[PDB]
Design a protein around this nucleic acid. Structure first.
Ligand SMILES: O=c1ccn([C@@H]2O[C@H](COP(=O)(O)NP(=O)(O)OP(=O)(O)O)[C@@H](O)[C@H]2O)c(=O)[nH]1
Ligand SMILES: [Mg+2]
Ligand SMILES: [Mg+2]
Lengths: 25, 744, 249, 708
RNA sequence: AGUAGAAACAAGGGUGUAUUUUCCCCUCUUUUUGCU
RNA sequence: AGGGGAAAA
């Protein structure tokens, strides 16, 4: 029910996840 | 945004978040190589704080000794060991005057303790120095070796169980012209390893006979082995610790008993109380001092530590204090209590393992023992070690350094605390003769001192007076580690008081986890640790639940006891799944059997087996608590091959223990242990209550066993449990055993 | 008869004759603790890296006659040892689980009897009533309370003497029971424990748990009775108070 | 007189008496009168008991059941247990003091006394002493007089006659040597044991050398101390003391403290056992393949999920290393993975061939051979080991970025806590809801990912080190998580090759080689990667918001080492969570008591309350309770990862400065004595550790913001 | 090379956890690596 | 009564 959220979380600035990206073709 | 946890202190007071200043989640620092450097450094430091003393040569050990007592009064604020005997005696006299009858009652209690104390008490200690082998051995092993050597040399007063008799034997040994000892010798053989095809030096250890002249034995008896303190938090640099030999431990024990008796009757002493007791004592002292302070009066609390506490405490001052305490007492009591300071005033410190030298050109490394450091060219050592060796050379004999000053790292904690408490007691209005006065509490070397004075200049005068008195008695306050503020907040032995003691949960973190004893024992330990931290260290309910979950996870992984209805695969998975499917009441199984976790805040105080006993399956309950578990040791019936029933569950098994050395054989030394265990088991068979409480008696093993057998046979015959023939056979066997004993 | 024959055989040897004849009863305590092997440190780490091994347990050789070498899935349960005196055998936790799921079953278990105090605690918790939780400032006083009530009539010394009299009548020594309550409890326990199949030492520990009184210094806020101290972790907090009433009288 | 006793009595009686006296630390050499008294008493008791038997009928017979049982001459415990057994069996009363004989036929205890004075006085003394009309008393005299209780001489006239004749013979023999006077006169004080403990010989000389300078003997010092009285000794000595010895308080004002001085040198480099913010993981979704659970199988599957491997080449070489060895190590790892995949039944663990590259990388045969000093005394070029201090390093900006990343909120859960018992008490329900909040906040933190990664890596390393000590093992770096969709995901970060692990001491280090995937170009912050050798191993097609982008994928390869203590404490990294949560809960609790209600929901949801937790160019920045929890968790995790003596010393010596600053903020008029010394002690602990330097910078910022 | 730091490991004896105090738990000796 | 574990000096 409770989802942690941070005001510092940018929904667009991290365009991709450099630590855990999606690479499956 | 640059995250800065320290900024959190802007809102919450530092005390209330002090737990975040303890980095106790990481591994503590450890010492890697030799402790010789630290021992040399501490010896040099002790001899430098007293360099203005008197130098003499001991007529018995032939070693230089430095006496700073009654030395020149210090001119600066640097550490100084020049304690004044008259000042110490006056402090003791004022302490006695402030608490009339304290010394007399303490001496009476100590006499009672001394007369009734057994020798086996010395076995309570951890690793101890052994002069027979010249190395560290378990306390029991060292005591046994010392007793055997004394017996072989004609000293048999230890045959009585009293410890004072053992001390008399030590004193007698200190007079013999020569001592015959049994030490260990080494035999080396080059052997090819069959797993790696490399040559190794297989080692075999055996026993031999050696002879020590008077001086060598005397040096060995006064020696303290030195090593490095490991796993100590809060220090960048390591320091040295000492272990005394078997000849010094009894006298030190009696002195510590006297000091503990004295400390118990002292409201300003932080020992022997500890934990919640110490916190209550500190809070009571602080509240009493704050209340007694008048509305106009200014009260200031100073948190203080003492610099090089053990290096500035002289055994001669301890001797003076003991002499004053034991006034108007039997001469034998005074002698036995005063021996320990005499031994410590002539003590020698063993340097340790030595050093490691490396020949890069030939690609070799060797371990130079301490005994050789006195006869090695100084070009090999580096600058620091060269300076240390050059400064310590005059004190080196037989691989040991003469160290007259200093008490060697906490050997007289209670006596030092008594001295500190006397200095604190010197702060009453009747002694300062001024509007200012001071009180507080002291533990070992740490202290909290509360000074009350009408104005700030009075506080300054009181602090200066206390500092000067401490320097006079030989106590050097650490200015860089101490501080002073208005009363209400302070620190003492990692206890932070801010209008009331605050919880410090970080220090308890290491206790959390799996203790690695067995399944049931580890579960009990973890649950009880969580409960006790909830009670004491203000661990929250939700945090307690999270800790319970984490402990359960760690325990399940450690003992491979994951839930039966789980897809994790491991060696134990198949059996756990079979048991899970076989049983009906799935909540009754223990966690170690893949059962669920029924624990919560409600029942943290209930053992697991009893927690879910009603939920256990009848067949499962019978199997788990069978009287004949093969994993738990069984005991033979007493006075009867039937064995006593067992109640321990199958989860209390005994893990395997390994005590092997690399490329070393010790079959010649474990035989003694095996035979001792056999004899002890037989005696326990003869005396059922021996295990419950330690038995006493001067008679020999076989004598006591035969006497018990005879009396038991007679009583059984009288009662009617045995007939004439069995009584006759038992009597005949006893008679032949006695005859064999008499005629070996 | 058996013990005396064992003593004769043991004294027949040479070294053991010296050990028995040249060692006093006091020195037993010294030689019993005698050891010469390497010391073990960090038991938790040892357990952590040993539980991954095949056989981290050691059991009596009798286990060979009870637990089969392998289970149905061919998973070995125990293996013969070489570095031993032929009185110990290596064992795996699979053996423990196999015993727990297929071992002999019996209707007589001594766990409830030996641990009556813990079952009393369980019964008290089961029938307790819970009240509302109050969030209020909590003032705690560090005082000496009791954790084990023991026997009200008997003190620590009296309880120890009664235990020794009940379990080891012939080894009490010069001690004598004086208090009438002491004698009554001794008679009651002697009647109750008569023909007990448990080891005397464990019976003595049982009696110690049931009778001796233990006190500790704790921060308490509210009740002081033992029934309340045992639940202090639950009924008391830094800022909350949980009303509770143990099911006991 | 001792020799007389030795030559008079039987050897068994003599040795029994010697044992009985030595039982109480009495020396027969100096206590000769008591020795003779005890010997005579034992002889009398033995003569009384002997030559008296009991036939099967049950009547006394004199020549089998002995008539009398001896209790004297035994140990205190032995005698007492004999008495207890007799009392328990026959049911007679327990004597208050140890008797000397027990008569079965009469079924009672008897005390036998031998005296030199008149019989009546001693009989009265004994009767008063025992004060029990159940133990028989029998007193003999060397003059030939005998008395009993109620004139009941149980022994036959003949035996008593023998006893009296023996006593008279001993009396005459003693009198012939003129030793009777002392023996008779000493009976008065034979019941008191005088403790003796004397200092003589070498011990006396040692004592004479353990006194203040102006004393020559221990007795002189004792005499001086006994008569000592206090007359202004302390006051006079203080008056003589120079006034330069003082404790002058220097006020700690708002302008006194100064920022700490960090060291100087080349920028500090990463030293963690694995990558933290530059880590790249190849993941498999919902792993259900056969053999799931075995690390090697999962690693092979994860590697199979990625296409784009190219020819590896050096991008950032290791300055001090042999980079071709690292390249060959990576190629060998790939070849070994291919070979193991070729086989059908992949083994649980895979050992690696001891090739030259692995031998060098793992430091095999690098230690000089150890030899005993006895066999190397002729070596001429032996030099002591080096003990140089660590080289100072400057503070770099990458550590702050690493911490900032560690404090962030992730999308995937990283910890799955086990279930607990049902909640019944209201406090349990409150704790359950609070724990739900805490678990939600903490399970989605990057620090939790680091905790799990470190725990798994350390567990695997220790298991391999102890199980296989002389083999090169391959240990994939694996982690498990749950994505936003609730589906399990298994991630591979890289590989670790473990060297020989013949670890004897707790500080013995096992070397290993770590190869980790990453997307971070090493050339942006080369100083951070001084120890690493970074290759270009692939090209990765990542999906962005607008489209797809191809980027290089590097392999950070380095040699590290770890000890048993380090692995042990790495396994216990979940404890870090507690260190944070316990604090956070406490804070919440501290507020609830004020508001008389639980503020967890308000703190976590409404975010009404915030704490200063960060700094920005604008100034101090405030975060909610969740941000504070995550920050404390990250701090604990970094304490665990970057643990070192420098950190411990710095924390210990900076706690004092923090407390002094707090006292200043409390208007308690704090004062110091050697504040410069405290600053020096604090700065002595800042040498090269990036974590400690970052903590020092944090302390400087806190001082700046708290002084104002 | 690397770990690491006042001296060591990088195999070839582990011969280096001491005193005091406090708190907690227990009752004996003779071919593997899976945190879903 | 003893052993083990944790903390502080
Ligand atoms: O591990 C320990 C800690 C403390 N102690 C004993 O407790 C006393 C105080 O321990 P301490 O922590 O105050 N250190 P100290 O000796 O005063 O030197 P410094 O750091 O420069 O102030 C020491 O002098 C020892 O006698 C030990 O014996 N072993
Ligand atoms: Mg100190
Ligand atoms: Mg201190």
């Amino acid at each position: 029910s409770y989802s942690p959220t941070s005001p510092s979380y940018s929904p667009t600035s991290p365009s991709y996840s450099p630590t855990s990206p999606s690479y499956s073709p | 945004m640059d995250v800065n946890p320290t900024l959190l202190f802007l809102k919450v007071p530092v005390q209330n978040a002090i737990s975040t200043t303890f980095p106790y989640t990481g591994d503590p620092p450890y010492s890697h190589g030799t402790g010789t450097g630290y021992t040399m450094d501490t010896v040099n430091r002790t001899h430098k704080y007293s360099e203005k003393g008197k130098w003499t040569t001991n007529t018995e050990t032939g070693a230089p000794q430095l006496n700073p007592i009654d030395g020149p009064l210090p001119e600066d604020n640097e550490p100084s060991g020049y304690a004044q005997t008259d000042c110490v005696l006056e402090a003791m006299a004022f302490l006695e005057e402030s608490h009339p009858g304290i010394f007399e009652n303490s001496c009476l209690e100590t006499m009672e303790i001394v007369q009734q104390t057994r020798v086996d008490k010395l076995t309570q200690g951890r690793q101890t120095y052994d002069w027979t082998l010249n190395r560290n051995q378990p306390a029991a092993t060292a005591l046994a070796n010392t007793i055997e050597v004394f017996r072989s040399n004609g000293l048999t007063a230890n045959e009585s169980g009293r410890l004072i008799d053992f001390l008399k034997d030590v004193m007698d040994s200190m007079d013999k012209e020569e001592m015959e000892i049994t030490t260990h010798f080494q035999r080396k053989r080059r052997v090819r390893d069959n797993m790696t095809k490399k040559m190794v030096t297989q080692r075999t250890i055996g026993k031999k006979k050696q002879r020590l002249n008077k001086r060598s034995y005397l040096i060995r008896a006064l020696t303290l082995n030195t090593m490095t303190k490991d796993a100590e938090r809060g220090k960048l640099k390591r320091r040295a610790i000492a272990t005394p030999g078997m000849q010094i431990r009894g006298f030190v024990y009696f002195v510590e008993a006297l000091a503990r008796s004295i400390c118990e009757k002292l409201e300003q002493s932080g020992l022997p109380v500890g934990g919640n007791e110490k916190k209550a004592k500190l809070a009571n002292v602080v509240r009493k001092m704050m209340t007694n302070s008048q509305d106009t009066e200014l009260s200031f609390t100073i948190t203080g530590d003492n610099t090089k506490w053990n290096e500035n405490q002289n055994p001669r001052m301890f001797l003076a204090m003991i002499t004053y305490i034991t006034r108007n007492q039997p001469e034998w009591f005074r002698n036995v209590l005063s021996i320990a300071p005499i031994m410590f005033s002539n003590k020698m410190a063993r340097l340790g393992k030595g050093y490691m030298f490396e020949s890069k050109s030939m690609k070799l490394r060797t371990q130079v023992p301490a005994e050789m450091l006195a006869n090695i060219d100084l070009k090999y050592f580096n600058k620091s070690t060269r300076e240390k060796i050059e400064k310590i050379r005059p004190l080196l004999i037989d691989g040991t350094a003469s160290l007259s000053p200093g008490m060697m790292m906490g050997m007289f904690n209670m006596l030092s605390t008594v001295l500190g408490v006397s200095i604190l007691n010197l702060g009453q209005k009747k002694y300062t003769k001024t509007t200012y006065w001071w009180d507080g509490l002291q533990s070992s070397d740490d202290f909290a001192l509360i000074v009350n004075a009408p104005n700030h200049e009075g506080i300054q005068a009181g602090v200066d007076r206390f500092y000067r008195t401490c320097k006079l008695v030989g106590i050097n306050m650490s200015k860089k580690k101490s501080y002073i503020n208005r009363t209400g907040t302070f620190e003492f032995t990692s206890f932070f008081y801010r209008y009331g003691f605050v919880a410090n949960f970080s220090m308890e973190l290491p206790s959390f986890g799996v203790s690695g004893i067995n399944e049931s024992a580890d579960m009990s330990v973890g649950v009880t640790v969580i409960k006790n931290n909830m009670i004491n260290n203000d661990l929250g309910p939700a945090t307690a639940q999270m800790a319970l979950q984490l402990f359960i996870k760690d325990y399940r992984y450690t003992y491979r006891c994951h839930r039966g209805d789980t897809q994790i695969q491991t060696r134990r998975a198949f059996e756990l799944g079979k048991l899970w499917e076989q049983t009906r009441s799935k909540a009754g199984l223990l966690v170690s059997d893949g059962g669920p976790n029924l624990y919560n805040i409600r029942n943290l105080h209930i053992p697991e087996v009893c927690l879910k006993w009603e939920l256990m399956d009848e067949d499962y309950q019978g199997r788990l608590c069978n009287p004949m578990n093969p994993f738990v040791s069984h005991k033979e019936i007493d006075s009867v091959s039937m064995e006593y029933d067992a109640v321990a569950t199958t989860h209390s098994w005994i893990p395997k223990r390994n005590r092997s050395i690399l490329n070393t054989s010790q079959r010649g030394i474990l035989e003694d242990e095996q035979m001792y265990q056999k004899c002890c088991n037989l005696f326990e068979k003869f005396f059922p209550s021996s295990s419950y409480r330690r038995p006493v008696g001067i008679s020999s093993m076989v004598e006591a066993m035969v006497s018990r057998a005879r009396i038991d046979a007679r009583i059984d015959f009288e009662s009617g449990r045995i007939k004439k023939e069995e009584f006759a056979e038992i009597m005949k066997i006893c008679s032949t055993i006695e005859e064999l004993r008499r005629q070996k | 008869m058996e013990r005396i024959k064992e003593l004769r055989d043991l004294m027949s040897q040479s070294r053991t004759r010296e050990i028995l004849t040249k060692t006093t009863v006091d020195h037993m305590a010294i030689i019993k603790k005698y050891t010469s092997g390497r010391q073990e440190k960090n038991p938790a780490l040892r357990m952590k890296w040993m539980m991954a091994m095949k056989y981290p347990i050691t059991a009596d050789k009798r286990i060979m006659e009870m637990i089969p070498e392998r289970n149905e899935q061919r998973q070995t349960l125990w293996s013969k040892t070489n570095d031993a005196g032929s009185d110990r055998v290596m064992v795996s936790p699979l053996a423990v689980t196999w015993w727990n799921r297929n071992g002999p079953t019996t209707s007589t278990v001594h766990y409830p009897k030996v641990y009556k105090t813990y079952f009393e605690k369980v019964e008290r918790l089961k029938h307790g009533t819970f009240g509302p939780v109050h969030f209020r400032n909590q003032v705690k006083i560090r005082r000496r309370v009791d954790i084990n009530p023991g026997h009200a009539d008997l003190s620590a010394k009296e309880a120890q003497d009664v235990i020794m009299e009940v379990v080891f009548p012939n080894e009490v020594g010069a001690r004598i029971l004086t208090s009438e309550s002491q004698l009554t409890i001794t008679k009651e326990k002697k009647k109750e424990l008569q023909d007990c199949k448990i080891a005397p030492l464990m019976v003595a520990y049982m009696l110690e748990r049931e009778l001796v009184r233990k006190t500790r210094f704790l921060p308490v806020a509210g009740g002081t009775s033992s029934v309340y101290i045992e639940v202090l972790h639950l009924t008391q907090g830094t800022c909350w108070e949980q009303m509770y009433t143990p099911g006991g009288e | 007189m001792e020799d007389f006793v030795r030559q008079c009595f039987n050897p068994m009686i003599v040795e029994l008496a010697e044992k009985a006296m030595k039982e109480y630390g009495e020396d027969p050499k100096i206590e000769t009168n008591k020795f003779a008294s005890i010997c005579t008493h034992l002889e009398v008791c033995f003569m009384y008991s002997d030559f008296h038997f009991i036939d099967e009928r049950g009547e006394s017979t004199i020549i089998l059941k002995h008539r009398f049982e001896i209790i004297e001459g035994r140990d205190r415990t032995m005698a007492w247990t004999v008495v207890n057994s007799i009392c328990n069996t026959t049911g007679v009363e327990k004597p208050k003091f140890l008797p000397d004989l027990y008569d079965y036929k009469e079924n009672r205890f008897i005390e036998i006394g031998v005296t030199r004075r008149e019989v009546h006085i001693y009989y009265l003394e004994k009767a008063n002493k025992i004060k029990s009309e159940k133990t028989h008393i029998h007193i003999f005299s060397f003059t030939g007089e005998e008395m009993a209780t109620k004139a009941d001489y149980t022994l036959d006239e003949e035996s008593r006659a023998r006893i009296k004749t023996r006593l008279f013979t001993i009396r005459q023999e003693m009198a012939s040597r003129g030793l009777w006077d002392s023996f008779r006169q000493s009976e008065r004080g034979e019941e008191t044991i005088e403790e003796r403990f004397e200092i003589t010989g070498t011990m006396r000389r040692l004592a004479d050398q353990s006194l203040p300078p102006n004393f020559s003997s221990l007795e002189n010092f004792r005499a001086y101390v006994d008569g000592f009285e206090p007359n202004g000794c302390i006051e006079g000595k203080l008056s003589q003391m120079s006034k330069e010895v003082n404790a002058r308080i220097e006020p700690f004002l708002r302008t006194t403290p100064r920022p700490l001085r960090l060291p100087d040198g080349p920028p500090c480099s990463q030293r963690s056992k694995f990558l933290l913010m530059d880590a790249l993981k190849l993941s498999i979704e919902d792993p259900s393949h056969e053999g799931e659970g075995i690390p090697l199988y999962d690693a092979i599957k994860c590697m199979k999920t990625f296409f784009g491997w190219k020819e590896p080449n050096i991008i950032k070489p290791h300055e001090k290393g042999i980079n071709p060895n690292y390249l060959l190590t990576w190629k060998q790892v790939l070849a070994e993975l291919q070979d193991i995949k070729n086989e059908e039944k992949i083994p649980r663990t895979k050992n690696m061939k001891k090739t030259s590259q692995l031998k060098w990388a793992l430091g095999e045969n690098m230690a000089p051979e150890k030899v005993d000093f006895e066999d190397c005394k002729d070596v001429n070029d032996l030099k002591q080991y080096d003990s140089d201090e660590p080289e100072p390093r400057s503070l770099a900006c990458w550590i702050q970025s690493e911490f900032n990343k560690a404090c962030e909120l992730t999308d995937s859960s990283w910890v799955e806590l086990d279930e607990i018992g049902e909640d019944v008490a209201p406090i349990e329900h409150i704790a359950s809801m609070r724990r739900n909040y805490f678990t939600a906040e903490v399970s989605h933190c990057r620090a939790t990912e680091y905790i799990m990664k470190g725990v798994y890596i350390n567990t695997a390393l220790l298991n391999a080190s102890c199980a296989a000590m002389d083999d090169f093992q391959l240990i994939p770096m694996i982690s498990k998580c749950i994505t936003k969709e609730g589906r399990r995901k298994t991630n591979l970060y890289g590989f670790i090759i473990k060297g020989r692990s013949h670890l004897r001491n707790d500080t013995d280090v096992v070397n290993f080689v770590s190869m980790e995937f990453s997307l971070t170009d090493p050339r942006l912050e080369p100083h951070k990667w001084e120890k690493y050798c970074v290759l270009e191993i692939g090209d990765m097609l990542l999906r962005t918001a607008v489209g797809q982008v191809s980027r290089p994928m590097f392999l950070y390869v380095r040699t590290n080492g770890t000890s048993k203590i380090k692995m042990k404490w790495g396994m216990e990294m979940r404890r870090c969570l507690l260190q944070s949560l316990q604090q956070i809960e406490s804070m919440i609790e501290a507020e609830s008591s004020v508001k008389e209600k639980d503020l967890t929901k308000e703190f976590f949801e409404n975010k009404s309350e915030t704490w200063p937790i960060g700094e920005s160019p604008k100034g101090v920045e405030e975060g909610s309770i969740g941000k504070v929890c995550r920050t404390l968790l990250a701090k604990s995790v970094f304490n665990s990862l970057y643990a070192s003596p420098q950190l411990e010393g710095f924390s210990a010596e900076s706690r004092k400065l923090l407390l002094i600053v707090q006292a200043l903020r409390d208007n308690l008029e704090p004062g110091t004595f050697d504040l410069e010394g405290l600053y020096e002690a604090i700065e002595e602990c800042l040498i090269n550790d990036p974590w400690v330097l970052l903590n020092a910078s944090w302390f400087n910022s806190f001082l700046t913001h708290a002084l104002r």
